[PDB]
Design a protein around this ligand. Structure first.
Ligand SMILES: O=C(NC[C@H]1CCCO1)NC1CCCC1
Lengths: 300, 237
């Protein structure tokens, strides 16, 4: 039901909307995307035809405002903007729909892929990882570094993922060195779940957001965060049964959706081999283990 | 990064550093049971922690009681090693704490790093050097204090005796590594070479015999011959 109109499309670009994508020609009469499902976060993303280095996009939730895209010929990108005049916006969207100048969000009725990838992902949590408080939507690109990457530069353009470091005082209680390093349960359950995330839903939301930024932007720091959050659960002997069953579902859909041809740059051999075959949870991820063994046996 | 042939002189500079060798921490005899199964019996071990510049040896004796009721002892032994090295560093005055700890076995890196998180400026390093410190228990006085221990104990030695009065740390370490390599390759032969002339004794306060400079050259020769004699007997040519 929701719509993200475009003022125009002056430069040739591949436009992504969640897991879908389509090519727009230079000066093609393209005026946006309609029938966007209410109830989920969405990501609109861009790769310029003349420069694939320009790979960037916007997380948004149409419940939080009227958003549109307009090309900026000075900064050389498609920008998301908020229209505060509801009647002007409704009038623009009605005209473009009447003239059929919009692509329809192409959801198959049977298909829960997007829900399954974004089940725990909330815009309010996105806006804490990506700090730009004057906008209700969040810009991400291929080059943005994480707070953790910046510790090992510009802080305002960083991804504020929760720092996970297995060889840190936060991860290891004085006097429990071997126990805490070989069994990460205290770090997962006390420090991360009880301490920082408050519940498993926020932990999964960050994990899901990190995977989506990895997949949609090739964001290397996001890929690191996704694998660290998997490894922290798999490396804990004590995990609530509901979290294990949910993680198996989460990872199954992530592995299902990953483009076959990016498996080599998006998946860390060491982490997946450790997680599926060595870890405490080696026998807890039945669905994930089966799709990985059938889709990516080379990695394993 | 790794300590190798290319950065060897760094051992003898004025930055305090320790080698840690864990190969004698967990020691066992393997034997048959009454039912014809196999079992192990632990014997006392030791951490070999050495300042290569000064010769100071911090020999932490690991008493078999440490292992009682514990599982996965070869894994625990690395963590117990790291715990005791960490405790030794914390026991030293700040001006005596090492800048670097070099582990002889790469499996010691994570255990030691995790125990030393409170010391972020102490570098934990591996080495490409194949050092013969496993042969420490072929030094009679070191084996004797380890085997006689009835409780955990730390015993201090200077593994160079008084050699630094006459030679540099580089030459002292070279002599030690040659002696331990000989003891490791053919213990009986090495001991015979060291102890054959009864007129040259070991001082009460020393580990090795009281060789004159000329006698050390002959001994060093006899040790190099042994290592090549044994390398001949091994490979046939
Ligand atoms: O006790 C010292 N060294 C260790 C001994 C124990 C058995 C063999 O070597 N030296 C002391 C003597 C005078 C000053 C320090």
């Amino acid at each position: 039901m929701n719509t993200v109109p475009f003022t125009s499309a002056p430069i040739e670009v591949t436009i992504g909307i969640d897991q879908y994508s389509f090519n727009v020609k230079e000066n093609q009469p393209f005026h946006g995307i309609k029938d966007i499902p209410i109830g989920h976060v969405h990501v609109i993303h861009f790769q310029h035809a003349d420069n694939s280095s320009m790979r960037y996009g916007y997380w948004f939730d149409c419940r939080m405002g009227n958003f549109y895209i307009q090309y900026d010929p000075k900064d050389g990108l498609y920008k998301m903007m908020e229209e505060r005049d509801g009647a002007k916006f409704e009038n623009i969207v009605h005209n473009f729909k009447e003239r059929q100048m919009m692509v329809s969000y192409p959801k198959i009725d049977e298909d829960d892929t997007w829900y399954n990838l974004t089940e725990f992902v909330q815009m309010d949590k996105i806006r804490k990882i990506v700090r730009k408080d004057e906008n209700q939507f969040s810009y991400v690109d291929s080059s943005m570094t994480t707070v953790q990457e910046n510790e090992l530069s510009d802080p305002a353009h960083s991804l504020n993922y929760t720092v996970i470091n297995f060889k840190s005082r936060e991860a290891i209680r004085p006097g429990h060195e071997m126990e805490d390093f070989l069994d990460k349960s205290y770090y997962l359950n006390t420090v991360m779940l009880q301490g920082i995330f408050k519940n498993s839903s926020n932990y999964f939301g960050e994990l899901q957001f990190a995977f989506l930024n990895a997949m949609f932007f090739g964001n290397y720091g996001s890929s690191l965060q996704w694998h660290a959050m998997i490894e922290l659960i798999c490396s804990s002997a004590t995990v609530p049964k509901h979290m294990l069953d949910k993680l198996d579902e989460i990872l199954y859909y992530q592995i299902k959706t990953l483009p076959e041809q990016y498996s080599d740059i998006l998946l860390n051999e060491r982490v997946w081999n450790i997680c599926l075959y060595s870890s405490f949870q080696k026998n807890s991820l039945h669905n994930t283990e089966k799709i990985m063994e059938n889709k990516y046996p080379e990695l394993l | 990064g790794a300590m190798n042939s290319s950065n060897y002189a760094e051992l003898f500079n004025n930055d305090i550093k320790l080698f840690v060798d864990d190969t004698n921490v967990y020691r066992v005899t393997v034997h048959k049971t009454f039912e014809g199964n196999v079992a192990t019996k632990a014997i006392n071990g030791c951490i070999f922690t050495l300042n290569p510049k000064t010769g100071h040896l911090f020999l932490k004796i690991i008493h078999t009681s440490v292992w009682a009721g514990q599982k996965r002892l070869s894994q625990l032994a690395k963590w117990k090693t790291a715990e005791e090295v960490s405790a030794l560093v914390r026991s030293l005055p700040k001006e005596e704490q090492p800048k670097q700890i070099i582990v002889t076995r790469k499996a010691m890196l994570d255990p030691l790093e995790v125990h030393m998180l409170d010391f972020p400026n102490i570098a934990i390093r591996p080495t490409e050097l194949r050092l013969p410190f496993s042969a420490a228990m072929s030094i009679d006085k070191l084996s004797d204090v380890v085997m006689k221990a009835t409780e955990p104990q730390m015993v201090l030695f200077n593994i160079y005796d008084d050699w630094l009065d006459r030679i540099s740390s580089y030459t002292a370490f070279s002599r030690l590594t040659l002696l331990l390599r000989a003891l490791k390759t053919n213990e009986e032969s090495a001991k015979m070479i060291l102890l054959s002339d009864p007129t040259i004794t070991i001082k009460s306060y020393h580990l090795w015999p009281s060789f004159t400079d000329e006698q050390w050259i002959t001994i060093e020769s006899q040790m190099r011959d042994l290592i090549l004699t044994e390398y001949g007997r091994k490979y046939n040519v």
